[PDB]
Structures are given as structure tokens and as C-alpha cells.
Amino acid sequence: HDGFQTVKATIDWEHPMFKLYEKAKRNGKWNPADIDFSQDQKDFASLTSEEKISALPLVAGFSATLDILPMAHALARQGRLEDVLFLTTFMHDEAKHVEMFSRWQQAVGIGQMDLSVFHNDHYKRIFYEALPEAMNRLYADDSPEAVIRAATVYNMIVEGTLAESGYYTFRQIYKKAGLFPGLLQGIDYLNMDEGRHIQFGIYTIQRIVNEDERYYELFIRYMDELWPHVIGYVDYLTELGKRIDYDLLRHYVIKQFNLRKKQISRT
Amino acid sequence: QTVKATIDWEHPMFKLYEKAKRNGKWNPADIDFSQDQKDFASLTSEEKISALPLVAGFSAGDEAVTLDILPMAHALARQGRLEDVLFLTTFMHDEAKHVEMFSRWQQAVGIGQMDLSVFHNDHYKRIFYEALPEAMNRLYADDSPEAVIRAATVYNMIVEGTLAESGYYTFRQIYKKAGLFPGLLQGIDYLNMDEGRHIQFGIYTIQRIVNEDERYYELFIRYMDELWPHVIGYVDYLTELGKRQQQLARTYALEIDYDLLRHYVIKQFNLRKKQISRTK
Numbered sequence: 448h449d450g451f452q453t454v455k456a457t458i459d460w461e462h463p464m465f466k467l468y469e470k471a472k473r474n475g476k477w478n479p480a481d482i483d484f485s486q487d488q489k490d491f492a493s494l495t496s497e498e499k500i501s502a503l504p505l506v507a508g509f510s511a512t513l514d515i516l517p518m519a520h521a522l523a524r525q526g527r528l529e530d531v532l533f534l535t536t537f538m539h540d541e542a543k544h545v546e547m548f549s550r551w552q553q554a555v556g557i558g559q560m561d562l563s564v565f566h567n568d569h570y571k572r573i574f575y576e577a578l579p580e581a582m583n584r585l586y587a588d589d590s591p592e593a594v595i596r597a598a599t600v601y602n603m604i605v606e607g608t609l610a611e612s613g614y615y616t617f618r619q620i621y622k623k624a625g626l627f628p629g630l631l632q633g634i635d636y637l638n639m640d641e642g643r644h645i646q647f648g649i650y651t652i653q654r655i656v657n658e659d660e661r662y663y664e665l666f667i668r669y670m671d672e673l674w675p676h677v678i679g680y681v682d683y684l685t686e687l688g689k690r691i692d693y694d695l696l697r698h699y700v701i702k703q704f705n706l707r708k709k710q711i712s713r714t
Numbered sequence: 715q716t717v718k719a720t721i722d723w724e725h726p727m728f729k730l731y732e733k734a735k736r737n738g739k740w741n742p743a744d745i746d747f748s749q750d751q752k753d754f755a756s757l758t759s760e761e762k763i764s765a766l767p768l769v770a771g772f773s774a775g776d777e778a779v780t781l782d783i784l785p786m787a788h789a790l791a792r793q794g795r796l797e798d799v800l801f802l803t804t805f806m807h808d809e810a811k812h813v814e815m816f817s818r819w820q821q822a823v824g825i826g827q828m829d830l831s832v833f834h835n836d837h838y839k840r841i842f843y844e845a846l847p848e849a850m851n852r853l854y855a856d857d858s859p860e861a862v863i864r865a866a867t868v869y870n871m872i873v874e875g876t877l878a879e880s881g882y883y884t885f886r887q888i889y890k891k892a893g894l895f896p897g898l899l900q901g902i903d904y905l906n907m908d909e910g911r912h913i914q915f916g917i918y919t920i921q922r923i924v925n926e927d928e929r930y931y932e933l934f935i936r937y938m939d940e941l942w943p944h945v946i947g948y949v950d951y952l953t954e955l956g957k958r959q960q961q962l963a964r965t966y967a968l969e970i971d972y973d974l975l976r977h978y979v980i981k982q983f984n985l986r987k988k989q990i991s992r993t994k
């Protein structure tokens with residue numbers, strides 16, 4: 448350490464990531480331990496076994512360990528105190544996301560099911576390969592390019608495209624049916640958390656584009672490199688369920704993906 | 715069915731995570747600092763500096779540990795200790811709020827542009843600028859029992875368990891007694907509660923490692939004593955600063971017993987050693 452900002456100066460109170468950190472503290476007090484899951488257990492019990500099986504592929508998607516931590520290292524190493532302050536709320540959010548799904552699986556009795564079997568090739572290419580490789584790269588390579596790639600795979604694709612669509616899917620299937628109210632309450636808290644996360648992704652990608660516009664084009668190319676595995680995983684889930692409007696859900700994915708591109712401007 | 719569950723609900727560090735969530739909802743943005751600002755204004759310029767060395771110690775220290783906890787969370791996730799990692803997210807968020815609280819107090823009392831670094835002497839720099847980050851960053855390449863005990867000893871048992879605990883006692887002994895800085899002390903009391911969980915994580919980490927090989931207990935003691943000369947060396951310098959700017963003690967009829975505080979620092983240090991046993 449050469450020195451410390453809160454000794455020489457203050458926190459940059461006007462920094463957008465400090466203002467995002469404040470929002471996270473106000474809006475992130477929810478606790479998975481407070482959610483009533485007893486109705487969810489009775490709803491899963493009340494399902495024929497045909498209906499129990501059809502829910503597992505989508506739930507299997509969410510069963511995927513502080514994925515953002517290397518970004519917190521890289522940005523701390525650069526002296527971005529406000530970002531680090533925000534990223535402590537990002538990490539705690541993700542601990543609560545693992546907690547909520549774990550508790551819900553326990554309540555409905557599938558926490559010991561090996562849900563891995565519903566991860567096809569395209570899923571694994573995103574969650575087993577591109578996400579951890581892009582984030583871990585940042586411990587050795589913190590370049591403008593490496594940071595945009597990390598934020599694209601994780602914040603714009605994994606959170607901003609796939610998770611968003613999964614949450615919308617959960618409301619479209621179960622909220623309408625009046626099923627699984629504890630799960631849906633959890634989903635709504637996760638969806639609010641993930642909004643701040645996507646905003647950190649957008650801000651990170653953009654303060655870089657405000658440097659050099661060549662990177663805006665890296666952003667699009669990286670977004671486009673991953674698209675075949677987003678839609679390839681979506682199609683596999685579509686196929687399994689048909690064996691609930693699957694064509695408006697595939698359209699929501701496409702909608703979300705192009706909407707992520709539009710939140711980064713060239714100027 | 716057929717696989718192990720994701721989370722061990724009974725693990726001691728999951729229990730600690732659940733308490734951090736329940737007990738850790740305070741927000742520095744809620745603290746009323748308007749009486750502090752009025753208290754600081756009314757001080758003579760001699761009285762406006764007797765508190766600043768300690769604030770300097772805490773602002774930097776809280777900043778340092780916010781940056782420097784990240785390797786421990788890396789190492790423990792790599793060892794598959796999911797429940798520890800869940801707990802360490804509350805630990806990390808706690809420390810960001812501690813840095814926030816101190817910066818807000820500096821900002822509110824009008825000293826936001828003042829460079830408080832000058833109150834970091836040589837021994838302060840050797841712990842917070844130097845030994846803390848080195849021990850923690852080591853865990854990126856070397857996550858052995860030995861490296862983990864050293865990190866948890868410098869961070870939890872010395873920095874939190876000795877220096878910070880003693881700093882909080884100092885604050886209550888001088889400013890709570892005088893009725894100064896009511897917002898700062900409200901923060902102090904919040905920080906003190908959080909830090910109980912942080913020391914407990916250090917105790918549990920250090921102990922689970924000693925329970926495997928007893929040779930590590932002795933490493934622990936040696937690391938504790940290696941750090942002591944810079945602990946007491948920083949404490950002696952702050953003592954020297956207070957004895958020389960006695961105007962705020964005079965004004966508020968405070969008998970500041972610098973030897974009582976020095977004994978508290980010695981107590982805390984011997985007490986952190988005692989909370990680790992050779993056997994178990």
C-alpha cells in the first residue's frame with residue numbers, strides 16, 4: 448500500500464458505484480431465512496410425478512461460487528475504492544442466491560437430486576467454461592479487453608440474458624398457476640438484486656467505451672460469440688418441456704440479448 | 715435420493731453467516747453526524763487534533779482490510795468451504811461499511827481535505843501498509859495451513875482482536891466520557907458488534923488448523939509475538955501524542971489514564987493467544 452484515500456481525502460461520494468452501493472444497502476436487506484416455504488412443499492407434493500419432472504430442467508439451470516470475486520480483486524488493485532464497496536454487496540447477494548435455492552430445494556425435497564443431468568453441451572460451454580475462464584483471467588490479465596469480456600459473459604449474458612429470462616419464465620409458469628409462492632418471493636428479490644449487478648456490468652463496459660470506441664466493437668463481438676450457446680441451451684429446455692408458451696419465452700431471450708447490446712452506447 | 719446437499723445448515727460458519735445477516739443491518743448513511751459537526755467546530759485548534767490520530771488509524775486500517783480480505787475468500791472457496799465463503803461475504807461487506815462510516819465522520823466535521831497520513835508512524839506502516847497485505851496476498855499462491863494461520867493471526871487476532879478492540883475502548887474512555895462525537899460513537903458501537911463476528915471467524919479458522927497438527931499452535935504464538943513490537947510501538951507513539959496535546963482533556967475535566975489503555979492493549983493481546991488451545 449502506497450496510501451489510503453479515506454485518510455488523504457474522502458470516499459468519492461458522487462461516484463456512480465458509490466451511489467449504486469447505497470441503493471444496494473437500502474434494497475438488499477432481504478433474508479432467505481425469512482421466507483415461508485411451507486406452501487411450496489405442499490405444492491411440490493401435490494404434483495403428479497409427470498409435473499414434478501417437468502420443473503427440474505429450469506431449476507437445474509439455477510443450481511449454477513463468488514463468480515465476481517476476481518473482478519473485485521482486479522478493481523481493488525486499480526484503486527477503485529467505490530467499485531469495491533459496491534462489489535461487497537454483489538458478493539453478498541450471490542451468497543443469498545445460493546442460499547435461497549438451497550433452502551427451496553430442501554423444502555421441496557430435491558436438494559439431494561443430481562440436477563446436473565439437465566446441463567447439456569451449450570449450458571456447460573457457458574457456465575463450466577466461458578464464465579470461470581473469463582473471470583479468473585482477471586487475476587493475471589486486467590486489461591481493458593479482459594474486463595469487458597468478464598462483464599459481458601457474467602453481467603450481460605449470464606445475469607442480463609439467461610437469469611432474467613429464467614426469472615420471467617418462473618413467473619410466467621408458476622405465478623399464473625398460483626404455485627410455489629416462497630420460490631416466487633425469492634425470485635423477485637433475486638431479480639431486484641440482479642438489476643444492480645447488470646448496472647455494474649453496463650457501467651464497467653461503458654467507462655471503457657468512453658475511453659476508446661474500438662472496444663464497443665469487442666463488446667458486440669463477444670456478445671455475439673456466446674449467442675449460439677444461449678439459444679442452444681434455450682432450445683434444449685424447450686424440447687424437454689414440450690415432451691406454458693415456449694415460443695414467447697424464446698422471444699424474451701432474444702429480446703433480453705439485444706436489449707443488453709443497446710445499453711452500451713458508442714458515444 | 716443420490717447426491718450430497720449444497721449447504722451444511724449446521725456448520726459453525728453457516729450459523730455465523732445467519733447471525734451476521736440478522737445483526738448486521740446497520741447503515742452508516744443513517745447516522746446523525748450533525749451534533750458531531752457542532753462538537754468539532756467548538757473545539758480550539760489544539761483540541762481539534764487530539765482525536766485525529768486515532769481516526770487516522772481507523773480510516774486507513776478499515777480501508778486496508780476492505781482491500782485485503784479478498785484472498786482469504788479466494789483460498790477458502792478453492793478448498794470447497796462453501797459455508798465459510800458465505801460468512802466471508804458478510805465480513806467483507808461489514809468492512810466496507812466501516813470505511814464508509816469513518817469517511818462520513820471526517821466529511822461531516824469539515825476535515826475531509828486534511829491529510830491524516832502523517833499520524834501513521836513507522837510501526838503503523840509495518841503492519842497495515844506492509845505485513846497485512848503480504849500475508850493475505852500470499853494465499854493466492856500458498857494456501858497451506860501455515861499461510862492461513864499467519865493471515866488470520868495478522869488480520870483477525872492482531873489487527874481486529876488487539877488494535878481495533880483497544881481503539882474502540884480508547885474511544886469510549888475519552889470521548890464517550892466527555893460527551894463528544896455522539897454519531898462517531900454510535901458507529902463505534904456498530905463496528906464493535908460486527909468485529910465480534912470477525913474475531914470469532916479468526917478463532918475458528920486458527921483452531922480448526924491447530925486441531926489437526928499441534929505444531930501449528932506454536933507457529934501461532936511465534937507470529938503473535940513477532941507482531942507485538944509494532945503493536946506496542948504504534949501504541950506508544952499515540953500515547954506520546956496524547957500526553958503532548960492535553961488541552962481537550964483539560965477542557966472536559968478528563969483524567970486520561972494512558973497507562974490503563976496501555977494495559978488494555980496488553981490484556982487484549984494475551985487474551986487473543988488464550989482463545990487458541992494447543993489441543994482439541
Ligand SMILES: CCCCCCCCCCCCCCCC(=O)O
Pocket residue numbers: 505508509511605606609610612613616681684685688693696697
Ligand atoms: C422451460 C422454458 C424454456 C424457455 C426459457 C429459458 C430461460 C431459462 C434460463 C435458466 C438459466 C439461468 C442460470 C442462472 C444464472 C446465475 O447463476 O445467475
Ligand SMILES: CCCCCCCCCCCCCCCC(=O)O
Pocket residue numbers: 768771772775776777779809812873874877878880881884912949952953972975976979
Ligand atoms: C493510546 C492507546 C492506543 C490503542 C490502539 C489504538 C488503535 C487504533 C486503531 C487502528 C486499527 C484499526 C484496524 C481496523 C480493523 C477492521 O476494520 O477490521
Ligand SMILES: [Fe+2]
Pocket residue numbers: 541606640641644
Ligand atoms: Fe447476479
Ligand SMILES: [Fe+2]
Pocket residue numbers: 568569679
Ligand atoms: Fe447444439
Ligand SMILES: [Fe+2]
Pocket residue numbers: 779809874908909912
Ligand atoms: Fe473487522
Ligand SMILES: [Fe+2]
Pocket residue numbers: 837947
Ligand atoms: Fe520505534
Ligand SMILES: [Mn+2]
Pocket residue numbers: 540541544637641
Ligand atoms: Mn445471482
Ligand SMILES: [Mn+2]
Pocket residue numbers: 776779808809812905
Ligand atoms: Mn472494520
